[PDB]
Ligand binder design. Structure first.
Ligand SMILES: [Mg+2]
Ligand SMILES: [Mg+2]
Ligand SMILES: [Zn+2]
Length: 461
RNA sequence: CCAGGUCUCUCGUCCGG
RNA sequence: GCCCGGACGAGAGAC
């Protein structure tokens, strides 16, 4: 994905849009109790901890476009993935304006607590003003759509989130693209019934984990995979995608019944953004923040992966591929072992930078013991070996607990980390409750007992 | 006084059948 | 006791 230009937006009659200049993350009651190497992310160029040109670091990810042409391997990939989806019987009609705004089975309402994007952002206009959950009124949304139409530009923001040291020093903050409310509504009428089907069908048919619950889904996964695993992450996913893959997606969409709205994918593939004072244009790259981000990412991942198998392993039977993706994050399997270092190598050709799922340096043989998906390991219970624990490392839970965006949230936050930690077992969960209680405010919280969590888990089956 | 997207899951608070 | 739904908030995870 590549940047086509940049100019003060004044010079094209777009407003200047300046976001906050401070992190909302303050150190936690438990800041010294537990340890961590993570600090809040760079939000502005004038950030002391910076050891590089910020704005060159944030846009650094647009590494350009390798391919533009759907080659023969991508086509068979497209052919195979789409045939898979065909079995889901995905209703291919537009979704009515009411359900696109307000939600329906498989599709949540629009988040009323996030902004309406351009132009509303610059008019001091909010989704709340426009949307009414109680009435489900589409009248005013229709007016605005009539008035401002679609394909509006996306307002760029740096995510306020925790970040490692190298990433605070190399100014590697993550960038989100504020989709316009008009385009979310438009995107969801076109595609609501597709999003819905994906949400309802986590697993190896969709090749997507969107809609899953790790506490319950970890027990499904090993039974769904083939005998040997391989797994991946990608460096800069959204921004590493060339238009070739977007065409491939368009072709998939056409094949399953969405031919008429495949043009929405071009607005994704060639997009315009507003960032502080500038205004820029990108070709290729996923505008992370647009409706469908997760679905389209995960769908493309399924294409990418089929492609490389076809190109690296002649006579590979894709009907024995079993893979689950969450955006770039993927765990995959095949009846016989495959070499992720080779697949990755071929990957390099289509513009992809592929890694082990943990962003380790070198690929290892992937086993039910080392594999990770969404950061969690897999660990059979000791009493019931068919039930599998999603095991998130305490290291991650330690990082989280050390900060707060608001201290009035400590009960919920810390309680929520308990529902992740106890999968590390009683001995480690109980040591956790120790440290939390090693200070006054901890002893204020209502934390659940290992046995309560264990009984809920088992009962939940 | 507020600025920061698209989502999934879970927890919590409150209100319903 | 067991469901089912609603509104708000929070954490985690993907981008
Ligand atoms: Mg990535
Ligand atoms: Mg990932
Ligand atoms: Zn242009």
């Amino acid at each position: 994905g590549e940047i086509q230009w940049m100019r003060p937006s004044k010079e094209v009659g777009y407003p200047i849009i300046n976001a906050p200049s401070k992190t909302k993350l303050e150190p936690s009651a438990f800041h010294y109790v537990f340890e961590g190497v993570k600090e809040p992310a760079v939000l502005t160029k004038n950030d002391p901890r910076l050891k590089t040109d910020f704005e060159e670091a944030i846009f650094s990810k647009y590494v350009g476009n390798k391919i533009t042409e759907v080659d023969e391997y991508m086509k068979e990939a497209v052919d195979h993935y789409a045939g898979q989806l065909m079995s889901l019987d995905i209703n291919t009609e537009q979704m009515c304006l009411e359900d696109a705004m307000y939600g329906t089975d498989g599709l949540e309402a629009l988040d009323l607590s996030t902004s309406a994007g351009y132009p509303y952002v610059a008019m001091g206009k909010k989704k709340r003003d426009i949307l009414n959950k109680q009435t489900r009124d589409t009248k005013e949304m229709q007016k605005l759509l009539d008035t401002y139409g679609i394909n509006l530009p996306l307002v760029t923001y740096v995510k306020d989130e925790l970040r490692s040291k190298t990433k605070v020093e190399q100014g590697k903050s993550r960038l989100i693209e504020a989709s316009s409310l008009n385009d979310s509504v438009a995107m969801r009428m076109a595609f609501g019934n597709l999003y819905a089907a994906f949400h309802k069908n986590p697993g190896v048919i969709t090749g997507s984990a969107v809609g899953c619950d790790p506490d319950l889904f970890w027990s499904k996964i090993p039974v769904l995979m083939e005998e040997k695993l391989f797994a991946f992450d990608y460096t800069g996913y959204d921004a590493s995608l060339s238009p070739a893959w977007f065409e491939a997606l368009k072709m998939v969409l056409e094949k399953i019944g969405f031919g008429d709205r495949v043009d929405y994918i071009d607005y994704l593939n060639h997009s315009h953004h507003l960032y502080k004072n500038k205004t820029y244009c990108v070709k290729g790259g996923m505008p992370s923040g647009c409706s469908g981000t997760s679905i389209f990412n995960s769908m493309i991942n399924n294409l990418i992966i089929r492609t490389l198998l076809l190109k690296t392993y002649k006579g590979i039977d894709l009907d024995h591929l079993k893979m689950i993706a969450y955006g770039d994050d993927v765990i995959a399997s095949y009846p016989h072992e495959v070499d992720a270092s080779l697949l990755a190598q071929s990957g390099k050709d289509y513009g992809l930078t592929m890694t082990p799922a943990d962003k380790s340096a070198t690929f290892e043989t992937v086993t039910w013991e080392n594999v990770t998906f969404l950061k969690r390991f897999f660990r059979a219970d000791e009493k019931y070996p068919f039930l599998i624990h999603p095991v998130m490392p305490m290291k991650e839970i330690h990082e989280s607990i050390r900060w707060t965006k608001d201290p009035r949230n400590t009960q919920d936050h810390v309680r929520s980390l308990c529902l992740l930690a106890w999968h590390n077992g009683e001995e480690e969960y109980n040591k956790f409750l120790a440290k939390i209680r090693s200070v006054p405010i901890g002893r204020a919280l209502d934390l659940p007992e290992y046995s309560t969590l264990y009984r809920r888990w088992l009962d939940s089956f």
